[PDB]
Write a protein that binds this ligand. Structure first.
Ligand SMILES: *[C@@H]1O[C@H](CO)[C@@H](O)[C@H](O)[C@H]1NC(C)=O
Ligand SMILES: *[C@@H]1O[C@H](CO)[C@@H](O)[C@H](O)[C@H]1NC(C)=O
Length: 725
DNA sequence: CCTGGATGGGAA
């Protein structure tokens, strides 16, 4: 009956991740397994016979078994990996090895990143003529230090005639390795000390599609972590360095202390799709340069964090393939009609990153003049007015104005933004009585995020100027009218959040709508509200058609049948997560006929005794995890015909009995029983139940632990065989 | 290259 691969899990992948193993597991027949993952175990020594039973392995991951500081040194016998003559992928990263082990020629992908291998010679990689991918980053840098530098000897990799990918980051390299295999398409040599580049360093690299030479001359101003400042003032780039790269699609020159651009650099890069110029000193350069003149196939340009009014250069009008532009951390306080003028006629520019720029003045109307803008991020600036649920992803004209300095919303600020479909105003300081006058131009707005503000919500004309509004986020919002009276007057509103709100005395005793389908009302005081007797007894009843209701964290200690009966009869989902429900009659679920999903986790249902799941509930999933459930009455789940998922994890069950379920147990798609102090006597009967539904219980192989006996406590229900008595 | 703003992943 047992799973064949104790103490690991069978997914042709055998998963043995995070099992504290100090040796390679031996386990039926192991002849059919092809993938083995042993990530973050404790294997510090490998041996000639350790993989002999796994001769058919294609993929082997040994990452994080013997990590150097922060020490650990891994020893590897000469023949360990040779047993696997068809090994294709191997990850040896985060292991304390000093030389590369002998490897079979079948190998295609190899990772030696974050090890202690300080020299690569022709003998290091002997016979790897089918190698396509080689990564070795992080062998000589501040988090994995070394004296001197990694050494890659001239022509060492020439035997790798099929090599397409090579990464040698964080290795204190002073020069590009010489005579690299001409087959290269990807070369990452960033974050070394290569302070000078010429065409010679890239000699015969004519199949390159991406080159990353960034971080080799680093300004270390306001560096959070240890950083080697460049001896030079700038990366020294020979003007002809890149010309022969005719298939170059990606180039990254980030953090190179570049003070000017030279159009020579890109002159022959006729398929440059992605250019990264971030973290340099190109503030003035992007304002005046001509370098962009012919960058005609460029789709992505990153100018972020490049340290009189900012105005992009005229050459930017040539970037007619440009889809995405990053201008974060440039720090310009003004956004006018000349700032981004040369972008406006670009036929495919859909994404504009403009955050962390301390913008305190913005004519946002400019974004209505663009050809295909779909997302402009203006978050984390200092905008305070007009000048003088967000997903929304990819498909909607979206603007992010979060974390700005808006205290008051004036409708003139939105002139010519009338195509906006999604908008965020969250984490501002808007203290305003919203009255239906604030968002007039926003005729097409569907999604509005106003969370983390100080809105006054008494006025029933609130948001009535937003006739397409479908989703309104008012979460974490802090004597006339009534709170939330506006909800009934928004005919399109399908999704609403009033979570973690300041719910005052004059709050409307009713929420009404014909359209709201999801209401998040978590983190409020529904416990205190429903304690007020009849006053809030029908609070949610007016939400006709409501499908989803979140009442998490509302300090609920009881749920009377009247309160359930007076929720909208359309409910399919109800969450009472993280309340204080101590007792609850399950037959009262009859008052929610269409209920499919019920979440009662984080409460204190000490047991599942009081009543049963009633005929003929349509309940599909029941989450009752993190309750101190010590007992379940037989046939409890028996009547829930449609039951498919049940989570009993983190309860105080000593067993899990078949009698709780009946025939339903075999249509269950999940049955989670983890983190129960199971009592693992030699007689224990739950073991035979769990094995029957093994395919449908998560983490059975080793995640289902014993709470007793004392020697078996904290250990798997297979740490000893329990079926021996 | 992706990711963030620092770094680690990655895998024809
Ligand atoms: C762009 O290419 C043309 C020739 O095709 C050349 O005359 C012009 O100088 C180039 N622009 C720059 C700045 O490289
Ligand atoms: C079951 O509940 C626990 C509670 O923390 C959660 O961690 C786990 O992801 C849930 N499992 C399933 C199958 O959803």
């Amino acid at each position: 009956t047992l799973p064949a691969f104790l103490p690991c899990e069978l997914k042709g992948l055998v998963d043995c991740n995070w099992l504290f193993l100090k040796s390679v597991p031996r386990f039926a027949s192991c002849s059919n397994i092809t993938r083995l993952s042993l990530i973050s175990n404790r294997i510090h020594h490998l041996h000639n016979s350790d993989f002999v039973h796994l001769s058919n392995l294609r993929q082997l991951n040994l990452k994080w078994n013997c990590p150097p500081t922060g020490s650990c040194h891994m020893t590897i016998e000469p023949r360990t990996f040779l047993a696997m003559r068809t090994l294709e992928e191997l990850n040896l990263s985060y292991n304390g090895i000093t030389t590369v082990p002998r490897l079979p020629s079948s190998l295609v992908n190899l990772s030696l990143s974050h090890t202690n291998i300080l020299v690569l010679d022709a003998n290091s990689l002997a016979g790897l003529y089918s190698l396509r991918v080689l990564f070795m980053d992080g062998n000589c840098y501040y988090k994995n230090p070394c004296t001197g530098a990694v050494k890659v000897t001239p022509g060492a990799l020439l035997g790798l005639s099929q090599l397409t990918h090579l990464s040698l980051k964080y290795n204190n390299l002073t020069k590009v390795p010489r005579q690299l295999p001409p087959s290269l398409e990807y070369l990452l040599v960033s974050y070394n000390l290569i302070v000078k580049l010429g065409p010679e360093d890239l000699a015969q690299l004519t199949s390159l599609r991406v080159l990353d030479v960034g971080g080799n001359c680093r300004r270390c101003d306001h560096a959070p972590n240890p950083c080697i400042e460049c001896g030079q003032k700038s990366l020294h780039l020979h003007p002809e360095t890149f010309h022969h790269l005719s298939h170059l699609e990606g180039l990254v020159l980030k953090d190179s202390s570049l003070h000017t651009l030279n159009s020579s650099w890109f002159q022959g890069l006729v398929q440059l799709s992605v250019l990264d110029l971030s973290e340099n000193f190109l503030y003035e350069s992007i304002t005046h340069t001509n370098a962009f003149q012919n960058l005609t196939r460029l789709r992505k340009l990153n100018l972020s964090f490049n340290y009189a009014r900012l105005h992009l250069a005229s050459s930017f009008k040539n970037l007619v393939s440009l889809q995405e532009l990053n201008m974060n951390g440039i720090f310009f306080r003004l956004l006018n009609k000349y700032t981004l003028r040369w972008l406006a006629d670009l036929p495919k520019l859909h994404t504009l990153h403009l955050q962390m720029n301390f913008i305190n003045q913005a004519q946002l109307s400019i974004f209505g003049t663009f050809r295909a803008l779909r997302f402009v991020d203006l978050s984390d600036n200092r905008i305070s007015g007009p000048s003088t649920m967000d997903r929304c992803k990819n498909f909607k004209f979206t603007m992010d104005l979060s974390r700005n300095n808006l205290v008051t919303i004036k409708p003139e600020m939105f002139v010519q933004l009338s195509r906006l479909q999604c908008l965020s105003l969250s984490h501002n300081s808007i203290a305003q009585a919203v009255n239906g006058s604030q968002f007039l131009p926003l005729t097409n707005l569907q999604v509005l995020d106003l969370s983390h503000n100080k809105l006054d919500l008494y006025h029933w004309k609130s948001f009535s100027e937003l006739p397409q509004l479908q989703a309104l986020d008012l979460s974490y919002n802090s004597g006339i009218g009534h709170q939330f009276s506006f909800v009934t007057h928004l005919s399109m509103l399908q999704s609403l959040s009033l979570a973690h709100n300041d719910i005052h005395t004059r709050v409307s005793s009713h929420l009404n709508s014909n359209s709201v389908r999801f209401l998040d009302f978590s983190g409020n005081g529904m416990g205190r509200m429903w304690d007020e007797g009849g006053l809030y007894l029908h609070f949610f009843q007016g939400l006709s058609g409501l499908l989803k209701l979140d009442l998490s964290q509302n300090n609920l200690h009881i749920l009377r049948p009247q309160n359930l009966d007076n929720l909208p009869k359309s409910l399919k989902l109800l969450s009472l997560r993280d309340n204080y429900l101590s007792f609850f009659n399950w037959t009262s679920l009859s008052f929610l006929p269409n209920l499919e999903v019920l979440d009662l986790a984080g409460n204190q249902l000490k047991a599942l005794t009081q009543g049963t799941l009633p005929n003929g509930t349509l309940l599909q999933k029941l989450d009752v995890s993190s309750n101190s459930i010590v007992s379940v009455v037989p046939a409890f789940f028996a009547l829930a015909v449609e039951l498919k998922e049940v989570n009993l994890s983190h309860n105080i069950l000593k067993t899990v009995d078949r009698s709780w379920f009946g025939p339903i147990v075999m249509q269950l798609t999940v049955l989670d029983v983890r983190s129960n102090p199971l009592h693992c006597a030699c007689g224990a009967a739950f073991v035979d139940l769990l094995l029957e539904v093994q395919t449908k219980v998560p983490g059975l192989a080793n995640g289902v632990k014993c709470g007793s006996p004392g020697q078996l406590q904290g250990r798997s229900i297979f740490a000893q065989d329990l079926r021996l008595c």
